[PDB]
Amino acid sequence: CIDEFDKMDISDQVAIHEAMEQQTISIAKAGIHATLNARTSILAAANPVGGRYNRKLSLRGNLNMTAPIMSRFDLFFVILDDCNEKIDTELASHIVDLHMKRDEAIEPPFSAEQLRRYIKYARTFKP
Amino acid sequence: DVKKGILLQLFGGTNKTFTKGGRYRGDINILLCGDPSTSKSQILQYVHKITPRGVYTSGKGSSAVGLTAYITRDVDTKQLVLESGALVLSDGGVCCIDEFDKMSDSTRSVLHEVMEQQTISIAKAGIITTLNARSSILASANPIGSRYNPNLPVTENIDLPPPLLSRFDLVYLVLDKVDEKNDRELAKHLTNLYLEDKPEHISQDDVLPVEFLTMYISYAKEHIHPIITEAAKTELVRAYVGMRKATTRQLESMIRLAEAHAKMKLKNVVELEDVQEAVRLIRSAIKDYATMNLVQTGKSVIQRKLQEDLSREIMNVLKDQASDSMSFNELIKQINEHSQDRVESSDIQEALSRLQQEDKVIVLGEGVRRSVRLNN
Amino acid sequence: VRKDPITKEWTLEGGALVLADKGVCLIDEFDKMNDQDRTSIHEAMEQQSISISKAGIVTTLQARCSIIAAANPNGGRYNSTLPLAQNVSLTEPILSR
Amino acid sequence: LVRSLSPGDIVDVTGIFLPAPYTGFKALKAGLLTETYLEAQFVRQTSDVEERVMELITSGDVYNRLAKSIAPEIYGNLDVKKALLLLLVGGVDKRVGDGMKIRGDINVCLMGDPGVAKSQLLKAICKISPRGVYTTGKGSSGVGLTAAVMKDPVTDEMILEGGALVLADNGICCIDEFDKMDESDRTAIHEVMEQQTISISKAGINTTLNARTSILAAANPLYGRYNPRLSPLDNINLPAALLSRFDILFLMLDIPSRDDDEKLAEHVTYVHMHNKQPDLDFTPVEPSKMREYIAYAKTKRPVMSEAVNDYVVQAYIRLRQDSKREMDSKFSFGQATPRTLLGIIRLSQALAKLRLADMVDIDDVEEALRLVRVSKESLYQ
């Protein structure tokens, strides 16, 4: 879970390569030349260019930076905030209760520990 | 109101572990700027004096490392020894930061971790770990002005990342209207002592506690656990609504902060009242905002305006060119020509670059800027 | 030829070309290639041999590799009806090669 | 007897002086030497002389007379000298009731280059001033100003050996090549503008020393000299943060002038030609008796009139007001920060002490002003 890929600036795009590639890790400091494969999910993130630019502006290039590694991304959820002061109110309440130390009955439809366990299960299946 | 917001910073918030995690603590990070010699130093002095665990540091006398993990050679045993840098120490109490605006970019990268996490993860060197440092942040800054000067974007006039900016809990901005009529009074105060040369009767005659304060602080800390109940909720929302009408964190702040207020006065539950001033205090930097921004400037009429006109013209000279390319020159010419919002040929160059690179434009040459084809 | 990792005698290494001499050179994203390389490329393509004068060692290796290249039409898939040289970034002199 | 001692202390110690055997390189000793040691048993840290002062007093014009009497050796700049006077005098400080103190002392900057032999002045003061210390940037090391914890002999052990500031504290400290002092130095000094404050957390030092020194700063403008095309603070390399500390910045710039240059030239010809420069007529004051009168004045601790207070205020408003009315660059430095005020307060507070005062007459003030306006604004010539 790599926050603010933006702070990658121009160095990490290099990384995305192997990353998006084999997740091989190529290392030669000349101490050795060694490719370390990897497999790791990408939970990734960046800000839009000018704040929320995406509205008229095309996402591509409203996102900008990831160059081709951009093309390496399977999914994207664009987040923008327009108040339905209905909704605004809603989240507002939500938060508030949360902020109220108690009593939060925020409890997952499924128990979370139960979840992680289940997660173990789901991996087992091979569709 | 400064002295006040601070006082709250002394009373700040309440820690919440949730079931696990939770852990918003009580933390409040106040920043303050203005014309220099504000005594802006003196305060940090005072707090540092008061603060048991606090530490006072200067911008640039610093970098992201000295706050943590010196891991120096012990050399007493001729050993290497992990030395908590400044921050880990400062866990608890507050931190006094000089010349925040001036900190090394490497430095304060630290901060975002602290501020957000409220803890710190050092994977570096021999031991990889996430250590918790929970401490309040008090930062001083000088506008570039150093008088931030009227108008301008203040948000500009402060420099800093508008995000990292936004991070600071309490944004205090100091300024001078030359109340005549103030300087007189201030000069009376100041001019005192004078007598007595041996320190005596500083603020007399006025009522103040001395050490009773320290204790009181201590006790209130120890024994108080305020809970706002429902009351706040409504108005509380309506506020931040008016605010975004700004960010959620603003709300969050409001929460923790007011919790300090009712922490003071020893309230285990909050009046819906005392939230008023709680808001008001935020409304102060706003009332200090009179006399996020980045985007605002950057939307047509700012950058959306910019590129919009840009493309517009490009389209025009295309049309009038029988679709042939617009020239760099003619571009710059009509674009400063229609004059008005002042499109500087450099800015021109930049936005042009943007659209082309956005493939919102397709053009080239050295002194030859041909036109575009926006496919996007 | 450069100083090896820390401490070893200083080892003269080839680009993929000399490596692929008589073999095949596989590369993509020349647009992504620094001119520093670009000169090298042109040089081989021309001479089919890689001369090296530094530091003290001065040689010409012979890379016989065949060039196989994947590239990115500048931006859009089809940049333009305009000729490909227009439709793509890289220099025609190299291209004619 | 342990722990009673601190660096930068002037103390009368009483102990029996005892040797302990040591010598140098073995090839270097005839024997037996002693190299010795000292042991410490015990430590101790206005009659007809008023006549000697009265000689100065009765003459009157002691401010100008003495003003001249300081380093008459150089031709010109009576203003700065007059300043140096008060610099030497100081006063009155204050304490706040809790209490916090306010210096209490003068911080003088001397700008301009190359010449003036501006240093020559510093040599003078450090000479005349008891507890004055002349230093230069590269020069006096940071650890020159700071104290090392280093063992000392006979007794024991790990001694905080101070220098510069600690060495000359309660007395002036003189800085040369002030531009060349680099940074760590600059930090400390920036701090010691807190007066009474030096603190070393490094390693075996947790201590915070109190430095009572006064500071005199001689630096050359950004190369080469004061580009008039360069604004103030352009031609000046230093940060205002420190400049804010500097109470008196005397900026000395040289535009050649046929007439005066004749005058100075004469001075320099007469002396050397004479050992004695002042003639027909100036009686310069023996720095000895001078120092005496100074001692006597230092006792005064004057008090301020409400009126002087008021005028002060009004003027101060005028001061900040015009200073900001200047707005952007040239000219400047703004802003006439309160420290400007406070400083002037201490300044008149000194001028009064030359009167020996307790009155603090408004003239002393207006003087301090004239001096102030005088310090800068020389940029206009």
PDB file of C-alpha atoms in Angstrom, chain B residues 36-37 180 183-184 187 191 193-194 196-202, chain D residues 92-100 102 309 313 317 337-339:
ATOM      1  CA  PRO B  36       8.589  38.809  13.136  1.00  0.00           C
ATOM      2  CA  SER B  37       9.734  39.842  16.596  1.00  0.00           C
ATOM      3  CA  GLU B 180      -1.848  53.912  17.854  1.00  0.00           C
ATOM      4  CA  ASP B 183       1.664  50.691  20.582  1.00  0.00           C
ATOM      5  CA  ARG B 184       1.033  53.135  23.359  1.00  0.00           C
ATOM      6  CA  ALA B 187       4.719  50.462  25.304  1.00  0.00           C
ATOM      7  CA  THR B 191       8.062  50.389  29.391  1.00  0.00           C
ATOM      8  CA  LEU B 193      10.290  47.322  34.335  1.00  0.00           C
ATOM      9  CA  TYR B 194      11.801  49.944  34.328  1.00  0.00           C
ATOM     10  CA  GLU B 196      11.100  47.230  39.325  1.00  0.00           C
ATOM     11  CA  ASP B 197      14.582  46.423  38.018  1.00  0.00           C
ATOM     12  CA  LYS B 198      14.621  43.458  40.370  1.00  0.00           C
ATOM     13  CA  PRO B 199      11.757  41.555  38.833  1.00  0.00           C
ATOM     14  CA  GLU B 200       8.455  42.651  40.447  1.00  0.00           C
ATOM     15  CA  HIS B 201       4.754  43.209  39.614  1.00  0.00           C
ATOM     16  CA  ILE B 202       4.849  42.230  35.929  1.00  0.00           C
TER      17      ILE B 202
ATOM     18  CA  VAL D  92      20.310  49.349  32.819  1.00  0.00           C
ATOM     19  CA  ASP D  93      18.812  45.926  31.940  1.00  0.00           C
ATOM     20  CA  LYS D  94      15.702  44.939  33.946  1.00  0.00           C
ATOM     21  CA  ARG D  95      13.932  41.963  35.452  1.00  0.00           C
ATOM     22  CA  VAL D  96      10.281  41.217  34.860  1.00  0.00           C
ATOM     23  CA  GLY D  97       8.742  40.177  38.189  1.00  0.00           C
ATOM     24  CA  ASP D  98       8.614  36.472  37.710  1.00  0.00           C
ATOM     25  CA  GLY D  99      11.162  37.186  36.620  1.00  0.00           C
ATOM     26  CA  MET D 100      12.460  37.488  33.166  1.00  0.00           C
ATOM     27  CA  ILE D 102      15.839  42.113  29.409  1.00  0.00           C
ATOM     28  CA  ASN D 309       7.941  57.712  27.943  1.00  0.00           C
ATOM     29  CA  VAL D 313       5.786  56.306  22.232  1.00  0.00           C
ATOM     30  CA  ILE D 317       4.671  55.164  16.217  1.00  0.00           C
ATOM     31  CA  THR D 337      10.534  46.363  15.314  1.00  0.00           C
ATOM     32  CA  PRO D 338       9.742  46.756  18.985  1.00  0.00           C
ATOM     33  CA  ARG D 339      13.284  45.755  19.644  1.00  0.00           C
TER      34      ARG D 339
END
